[PDB]
C-alpha cells in the first residue's frame, strides 16, 4: 500500500486533513442550500412585487461570510496536514529505501545499474511526493461536494432528487464502460509498446556494430514499426475514452431534461416552492461537473502508485546473505585460516559463463601464499568470493571449517582487509580517507600506521597538509601519490587477514617495497594471499599458486613449484529552449489544434450558459399566468436535449482531436530523436552519463513530457479561461456592478498564486540543490559499491545521508506552510467576495437597479465559473517539466557531430586500396584523460598480408581498430587510406567498405536471416546469397536443426542462441559486404578447435586478394601470420 509508511502522528495529520477536506467540500453545496432559502424567499419578494429586505439580505451575507472563515480553516488545515504527512512519509520512505539499497546484494547491483538507481530514487520519490502530497486533498474535497449534492437535494426538497437518482445507475454503466475500455486498451497498448521500447534498448545496446556497418537505417525502421502498431491504437483509445465522456454528458443532460419537465409539473401544481426544486437542480449541478473536472488528480495518484510499486518491491526485499544482522555465529578466537571448497560460481548478470568450477586450495594463519599466472584466470574471481560479495552459487568458503554463511558478515568483512585491486578513493581528506578503515582513529592511530607506507612527505607538504582534499577518484592525486594511502588505509583495521591484489603497481618500486615489506613483517600472525606484479615480489610468499581453469592441481612453495613444470617454471621464463521551439515542434498539424481550441471554448463557456438557462427559468417559473409547464417548459427540456447532443459532439471532438495531436507529436519526435542519436559520433556514447538506460529513459520519458504540455494544456486551461471569461461576459452584461466587485478577488488570488508559484519554484531550486548535495553522497556509494562494502563502512554513509537529507526535509516544511497559506487565501477570498458583493447588490435591488433574477443569474454565473480554477495552476509543475525535457532533446538534435556519418561533401572513393599507414600516431581516450593510449604508433599493411599482434592482457590491444573506422581523430600522427588521407573520405563508403569483428558481437531482436543480411544496407541483399556466405561461415549447415529455418527471433541479446553460436555467426555478418580489409580483434574465441579454425580455414583460400589485420591471441594460426606488433604501452614492437 502507499500509506504503509506512517507513524501515529502521521495518521493524525492525515485524518484531520481528510475530515477537514470533507468540510472544505461540503462548503458550497450547503452554500446552495442557503442559496435556496434565499431563492425561495427573495424570488417571492421579486415576483410578488419585504422592507426587511436589507436586513434579511445582509443576514444571508454574514451567513456566507461565516462559511468564508469555514472554508478558510478547512483549506489550509487540509493542505498543511496533507503536505506535512506527505513530507514525513517521504523522508521515512527515503531512509528505509536507501537503507534497503545499501542492504540489497551486489548481485542485484549488477542487474540494475547506477545512474538508473539514482534516477529512480530521486524521481520516483519526488513523483510520490506530489502524488500523495495534496492532490488527494483536492480529490476528497471535490468528491465531497458532489456527494453532498445527494443529501442536500433530499433534505431540501425530496422531489426531483428522486428522478435524478433514478437515472444515476445507467451513468454508472456509462463510466463503467469508460474505465473498462480505457483500461482494456491502454493495457494492450503498453503490453505491446514495451517492445518498441526494448528494441530501442537493444539497438542502442551496442551502438558499436550499429555504426560499424552503417545499419542505422534498418533499426530506425524497426522502431517506427512497433511504434506504428502502438500509435495506431493510440487514437483508438482516445476515441473510446471520449465516446465515454460524451455519453456521460449526454445522459446528464437528458436527465436534467426529465427533471426539468417533471418538476415543472410540480411547481405548476403550486406545490412546495421554487426553492426546493431550483436548488435540487443547482446543488446537483456544481458537484457533478466538478467531480467531473477531476481527471488530473486521479492522474497524479495513478502515477504515484505506479512509482511506489517498484520502490516497495525494493524495500520489502531480503537476501540470503545480509549486511544488517547477527544472522549467525560471531566468534572471538580466530586464526586467519581460509580454504576454498569445490567452488562452482557464476555471476547473476552474466550467468551463463562460469569462472570457478572447483578449487581445492589451502591457506593457514600467518603464512602468505602468492596468486599469479595469466589474467582472467581467476584472481579477481578469487578475491571477490572471499568477502562474499557474490554468494557462491555452489562453492563455499570456511574459516576453521564451519559455515561462513553462519559467520556474521558484519564481523567477517570487518576483520579481514583486502587493499583493493585498483585503489579507489573518496571525496575526502586523507584523514577521513584512511578513517574509512574503521572510523574511530585518533590522530596518532592515523599517523603511526600512515608512515608504514611513506605517506609523510606529499601529505605533510600540502597547504593544509592532511586537511587538503583528495579529489574525484583522487583527482587531486595520481598513482605516484594515490596507491600509497590505500595499502596503509585499510591496514589500520589490523586485518585478521590482509589480502594483496595488484595493489602496489602505480609508483616507483621504493614505495612498493615499503608497502610490501612493511606488510611482510606486519603479517606475523595474519596471512596475506598476494596477487602481485614482479616475479621476485611474488616470492615473498611461503607458497606460490597456479591458476588453472577452475581446478586446483598445481601450486606450492619455491622448491615446490619451479621443479613441477606447471605454471611457476613457466611463469618465470542546458541552454534553455523557448516557449517557441516546444510550440513549434508541432507545426504540421495545426488544424487539429484549431479544432481542439474551438471545441474548447464551447465546452468551457457552456456553463454560464446554464446560468442563463436557469435564470430565465426562474422568471418564467414565477407567474404562471397560463399553462406554462407543458406548454413552455417542454421547450426547455428540449434545449437540454440539444445541448446534450451538442455536448456529445463537442466533447468527443475536442478530446479526440487532442488525442490525435498527442499521437502525432509523440511518433514524430520519438523517431527524430532516435535517428539523431544513432547518427552522432562514437565519442558521445563511450561515456558514463549518456549510457544505455539513461538514454532509453531520456527518449521515452522525454517525448512523453513533451506531449504532456500541449496535449492536455490547451483543453484544460481553456475550459478554465473561456469559462471564467464567459461568466465574465455574462456578468459584465446584465448589471456591470457585480463583476468588478466579485473581481476584487482577482488581485488577491492573482498575486497570491503568483508569489506561491515563484516561491514554490524557489522551493524546487533549493530542493534540487539540497538533494543534489545529498545525492553526491548517494552516488558515491551507489557507484563505488565494490569498496563501500569491503571496508564495511556503508552505515556511516547511511547516517551522513540522513543528516543531509534533513535538508529537503525542512524544505518540505517551508513548502507545506507556504502552499497551505496561499490556497487558504484563495478559497477564503472567493467566499468573502460572494458575501460582500451579494450584500451591496441587495441594496442595489432596493433601488430597483437589477431585477432580482438578474442578480441571481450574475451570482450564479460566478458560482459556476470559478469552480474551474480547482487545478487551473496544478498543471504548471508539468510545464516546467516539459520545458526542461525540451531543452534536453534539443541538445540532442542540433549537435553537429565532428565526424558526420552522412559525409555529404569530400571524397567518395569509388575504389579501394588497402594501404593504411601509421607514423607516430599518439592518442588518448576522452573519459579520464590522465593516462594515454599510445606512445607513438607507426604501422601499415599491404594487400593480402597478416599483421598479427600478441602481448600481455589488455595493453592497448582493443584500440587498434577504433582508429581506422573513424570513430576518433587520433591526436597527432599519420593515418590515411592509400595516399588520399582518411580525412578526405566519405565515411559512409569507408565504413561500408571495411570489416570488423566486434569484441562481443550481439544479435538483435530479429530473425536469423536479417541479422546476417544486416551487413549491407542501401540495398536489400537477397535471401539466397546468405546460404553461401552462411555456409562459407559454416553456420548455415547448422540451421539444419532450427525449428523455423529463418524466422527465429533471437531474443534480447541472443536468448535462444549461446555465445559461441552468437560468435560462430559473427563472421557472416559482413562477408557479403565484401570486407577487403579484415580487422579481426579477437576473431574466434568461443568455439571448438576443429571448427574454430573454419573461421580462418573457409577463409584460407579466400582471405587472400583482400588485405586484413588478424588479431586472435593463439598459436596455430598466428605462427602462420605475417607481421607482428608487440604492445608496450602503445607502440610498435
Amino acid at each position, epitope marked *: 500500500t502507499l500509506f504503509r509508511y506512517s507513524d501515529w502522528q502521521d495518521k493524525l495529520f492525515m485524518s484531520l486533513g481528510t475530515i477537514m477536506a470533507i468540510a472544505h467540500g461540503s462548503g458550497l453545496p450547503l452554500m446552495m442550500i442557503v442559496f435556496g432559502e434565499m431563492t425561495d424567499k427573495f424570488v417571492d419578494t421579486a415576483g410578488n412585487f419585504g422592507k426587511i429586505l436589507e436586513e434579511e439580505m445582509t443576514r444571508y451575507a454574514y451567513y456566507y461570510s461565516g462559511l468564508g472563515a469555514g472554508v478558510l480553516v478547512a483549506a489550509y488545515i487540509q493542505v498543511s496536514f496533507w503536505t506535512l504527512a506527505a513530507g514525513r512519509q517521504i523522508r521515512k520512505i527515503r531512509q528505509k529505501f536507501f537503507h534497503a539499497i545499501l542492504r540489497q546484494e551486489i548481485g542485484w547491483f549488477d542487474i540494475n545499474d547506477t545512474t538508473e538507481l539514482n534516477t529512480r530514487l530521486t524521481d520516483d520519490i519526488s513523483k510520490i511526493s506530489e502524488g500523495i502530497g495534496d492532490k488527494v486533498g483536492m480529490f476528497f474535497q471535490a468528491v465531497a461536494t458532489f456527494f453532498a449534492g445527494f443529501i442536500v437535494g433530499f433534505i431540501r426538497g425530496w422531489k426531483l432528487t428522486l428522478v435524478i437518482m433514478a437515472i444515476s445507475p445507467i451513468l454508472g454503466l456509462s463510466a463503467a464502460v469508460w474505465a473498462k475500455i480505457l483500461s482494456a486498451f491502454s493495457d494492450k497498448e503498453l503490453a505491446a509498446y514495451a517492445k518498441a521500447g526494448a528494441v530501442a534498448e537493444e539497438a542502442l545496446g551496442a551502438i558499436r556494430t550499429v555504426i560499424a556497418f552503417g545499419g542505422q537505417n534498418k533499426e530506425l525502421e524497426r522502431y517506427q514499426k512497433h511504434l506504428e502498431n502502438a500509435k495506431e491504437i493510440g487514437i483508438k483509445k482516445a476515441i473510446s475514452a471520449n465516446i465515454s465522456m460524451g455519453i456521460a454528458f449526454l445522459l446528464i443532460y437528458a436527465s436534467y431534461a426529465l427533471a426539468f419537465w417533471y418538476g415543472s409539473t410540480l411547481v405548476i401544481s403550486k406545490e412546495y416552492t421554487i426553492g426546493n426544486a431550483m436548488t435540487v437542480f443547482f446543488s446537483i449541478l456544481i458537484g457533478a461537473f466538478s467531480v467531473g473536472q477531476a481527471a488530473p488528480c486521479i492522474d497524479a495518484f495513478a502515477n504515484a502508485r505506479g512509482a511506489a510499486y517498484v520502490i516497495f518491491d525494493i524495500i520489502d526485499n531480503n537476501p540470503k546473505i545480509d549486511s544488517f544482522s547477527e544472522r549467525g555465529h560471531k566468534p572471538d578466537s580466530i586464526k586467519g585460516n581460509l580454504e576454498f571448497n569445490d567452488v562452482h560460481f557464476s555471476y547473476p548478470s552474466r550467468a551463463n559463463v562460469k569462472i570457478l568450477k572447483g578449487l581445492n586450495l589451502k591457506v593457514q594463519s600467518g603464512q602468505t601464499v602468492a596468486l599469479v599466472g595469466s589474467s582472467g584466470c581467476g584472481k579477481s574471481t578469487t578475491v571477490q568470493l572471499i568477502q562474499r560479495l557474490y554468494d557462491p552459487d555452489e562453492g563455499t568458503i570456511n574459516i576453521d571449517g564451519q559455515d561462513i554463511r553462519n559467520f556474521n558478515v558484519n564481523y567477517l568483512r570487518e576483520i579481514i582487509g583486502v587493499v583493493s585491486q585498483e585503489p579507489v578513493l573518496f571525496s575526502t581528506t586523507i584523514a577521513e580517507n584512511i578513517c574509512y578503515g574503521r572510523g574511530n582513529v585518533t590522530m596518532d592511530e592515523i599517523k603511526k600506521a600512515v608512515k608504514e607506507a611513506n605517506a609523510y612527505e606529499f601529505i605533510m607538504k600540502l597547504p593544509q597538509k592532511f586537511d587538503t582534499l583528495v579529489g574525484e577518484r583522487g583527482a587531486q592525486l595520481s598513482g605516484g601519490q594515490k596507491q600509497r594511502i590505500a595499502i596503509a588505509r585499510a591496514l589500520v583495521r589490523n586485518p585478521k587477514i590482509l589480502l594483496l591484489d595488484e595493489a602496489t603497481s602505480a609508483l616507483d618500486t621504493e614505495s612498493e617495497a615499503e608497502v610490501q615489506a612493511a606488510l611482510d613483517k606486519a603479517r606475523e600472525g595474519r596471512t596475506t594471499i598476494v596477487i602481485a606484479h614482479r616475479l621476485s615480489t611474488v616470492r615473498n610468499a611461503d607458497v606460490i599458486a597456479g591458476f588453472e581453469d577452475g581446478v586446483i592441481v598445481e601450486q606450492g612453495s619455491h622448491s615446490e613449484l619451479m621443479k613441477k613444470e606447471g605454471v611457476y617454471f613457466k611463469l618465470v621464463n542546458v541552454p534553455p529552449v523557448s516557449f517557441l521551439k516546444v510550440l*513549434k515542434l508541432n507545426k504540421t498539424e495545426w488544424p487539429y489544434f484549431v479544432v481542439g481550441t474551438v471545441c474548447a471554448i464551447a465546452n468551457g463557456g457552456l456553463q454560464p450558459a446554464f446560468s442563463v438557462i436557469f435564470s430565465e427559468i426562474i422568471a418564467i417559473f414565477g407567474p404562471g399566468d397560463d399553462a406554462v409547464k407543458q406548454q413552455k417548459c417542454n421547450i426547455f427540456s428540449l434545449i437540454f436535449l440539444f445541448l446534450g447532443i451538442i455536448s456529445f459532439f463537442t466533447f468527443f471532438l475536442q478530446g479526440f482531436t487532442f488525442g490525435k495531436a498527442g499521437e502525432i507529436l509523440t511518433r514524430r519526435l520519438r523517431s527524430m530523436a532516435f535517428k539523431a542519436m544513432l547518427r552522432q559520433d562514437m565519442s558521445w556514447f563511450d561515456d558514463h552519463k549518456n549510457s544505455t538506460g539513461a538514454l532509453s529513459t531520456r527518449l521515452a520519458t522525454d517525448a512523453a513530457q513533451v506531449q504532456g504540455a500541449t496535449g492536455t494544456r490547451l483543453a484544460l486551461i481553456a475550459q478554465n479561461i473561456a469559462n471564467l471569461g464567459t461568466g465574465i461576459i455574462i456578468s459584465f452584461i446584465y448589471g456591470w456592478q457585480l463583476t468588478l466587485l466579485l473581481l476584487a478577488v482577482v488581485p488577491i488570488i492573482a498575486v497570491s498564486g503568483i508569489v506561491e508559484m515563484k516561491l514554490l519554484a524557489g522551493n524546487a531550486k533549493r530542493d534540487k540543490k539540497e538533494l543534489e548535495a545529498a545525492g553526491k553522497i548517494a552516488t558515491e556509494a551507489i557507484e563505488n559499491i565494490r569498496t563501500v562494502v569491503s571496508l564495511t563502512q556503508e552505515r556511516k554513509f547511511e547516517s551522513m545521508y540522513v543528516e543531509k537529507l534533513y535538508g529537503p526535509y525542512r524544505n518540505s516544511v517551508q513548502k507545506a506552510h507556504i502552499y497551505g497559506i496561499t490556497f487558504s487565501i484563495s478559497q477564503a477570498f472567493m467566499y468573502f467576495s460572494y458575501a460582500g458583493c451579494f450584500r451591496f447588490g441587495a441594496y442595489l435591488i432596493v433601488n430597483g437597479h437589477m431585477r432580482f433574477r438578474d442578480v441571481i443569474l450574475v451570482f450564479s454565473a460566478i458560482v459556476f465559473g470559478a469552480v474551474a480554477l480547482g487545478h487551473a495552476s496544478s498543471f504548471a509543475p508539468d510545464y516546467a517539466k516539459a520545458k526542461l525535457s525540451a531543452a534536453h532533446l534539443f541538445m540532442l538534435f542540433e549537435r*553537429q557531430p565532428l565526424i558526420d556519418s552522412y559525409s555529404e*561533401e569530400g571524397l567518395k572513393p569509388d575504389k579501394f586500396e588497402g594501404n593504411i599507414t601509421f607514423n607516430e600516431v599518439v592518442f588518448n581516450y576522452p573519459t579520464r584523460a590522465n593516462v594515454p593510449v599510445l606512445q607513438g604508433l607507426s604501422l601499415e599493411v599491404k594487400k593480402g598480408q597478416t599483421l598479427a599482434l600478441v602481448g600481455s592482457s589488455g595493453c592497448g590491444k582493443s584500440t587498434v581498430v577504433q582508429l581506422l573506422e573513424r570513430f576518433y581523430d587520433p591526436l597527432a600522427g599519420t593515418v590515411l587510406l592509400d595516399g588520399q588521407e582518411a580525412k578526405k573520405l566519405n565515411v559512409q563508403w569507408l565504413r561500408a567498405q571495411l570489416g570488423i569483428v566486434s569484441q562481443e558481437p550481439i544479435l538483435f531482436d530479429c530473425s536469423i536471416a536479417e541479422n546476417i543480411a544486416y551487413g549491407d544496407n542501401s540495398r536489400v541483399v537477397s535471401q539466397d546469397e546468405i546460404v553461401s556466405a552462411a555456409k562459407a561461415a559454416n553456420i548455415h549447415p547448422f540451421i539444419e536443426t532450427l525449428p523455423h529455418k529463418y524466422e527465429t527471433r533471437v531474443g534480447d541479446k541472443g536468448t535462444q542462441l549461446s555465445g559461441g553460436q552468437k560468435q560462430r555467426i559473427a563472421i557472416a555478418r559482413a562477408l557479403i559486404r565484401q570486407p577487403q580489409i579484415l580487422l579481426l580483434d579477437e576473431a574466434t574465441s568461443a568455439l571448438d578447435t576443429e571448427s574454430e579454425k573454419v573461421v580462418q580455414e573457409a577463409l584460407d583460400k579466400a582471405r587472400e586478394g583482400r588485405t586484413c589485420i588478424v588479431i586472435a591471441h593463439r598459436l596455430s594460426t598466428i605462427q602462420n601470420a605475417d607481421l607482428i606488433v608487440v604492445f608496450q604501452n602503445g607502440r610498435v614492437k
Partner: antibody
Amino acid sequence: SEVQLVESGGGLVQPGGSLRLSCAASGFNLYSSYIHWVRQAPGKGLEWVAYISSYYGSTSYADSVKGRFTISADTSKNTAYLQMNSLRAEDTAVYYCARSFSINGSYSWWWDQAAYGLDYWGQGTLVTVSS
Amino acid sequence: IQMTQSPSSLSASVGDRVTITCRASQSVSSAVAWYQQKPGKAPKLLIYSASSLYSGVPSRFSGSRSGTDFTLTISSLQPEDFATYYCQQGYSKLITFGQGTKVEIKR
C-alpha cells in the same frame, strides 16, 4: 569575458561544391543573441546574408541561395555551422561571422528583430569560387 | 525594405562638414546604420537609430532624421576617418547592406 567570433574552414571550392563555414562564438554562447553571416563583396562592399536565433529556432536563409545555405548554431560545442551547398561562382565574397544586438547586454528578444544594429563583429575566412 | 546610396566617393577636406546622406526605402521606419570598415577589415559600428552612438566612439557622427532621410555629418575627419563607410537596414524580417562607401582626402 567578451565576444570572440573565431572563423574556420572553406575558401577553395569549385562552383557546385559544398563546404562548412564555422564560427566559434567563444566568449559567449550561441543561444543568447542572434548570429548572422555578413557578406563582403570582392572590392564593392557589403551584404547581409542569413541568421539563426537558437532560442527561438527561428532561422532565415538568403533570397538568391535559399536552399543552398543551411544554418545551424550548435550550443553544446558553441559553434555556428553553415552547410554551404554548391557555392556558385559570383560568391567569392568575404564572409564575416556577425553578432546581433543586446539592448540590455544579456539576451535578445524575438520581436522587432535585430532593431539596434550589430554591436559585435568578427573576421571570417575569405571564400573564393573557381576551377 | 531596401536602400539607396547617395553619398558616393566624397573626398572633402579634413575639418569640414562632410555629409553621408544614404536614403533607405519606404518604411524601414527608424532602422538606419552607419558603420566603419577601415580598408581591409570588417565594419565597426558607429551609430544606430540615428539617435545613439556606440560606446567608445568620437562624437562627430551626427544623424538628423526626416522621414525617409537619415543624414549623418562628420566634421573633424581625423586620420582614423578616411576609411570605408556603409549604410544598412535592419527591419521587417530582413537586413540589407549597401555597396562600399568611403570618405577621402582633398588635395
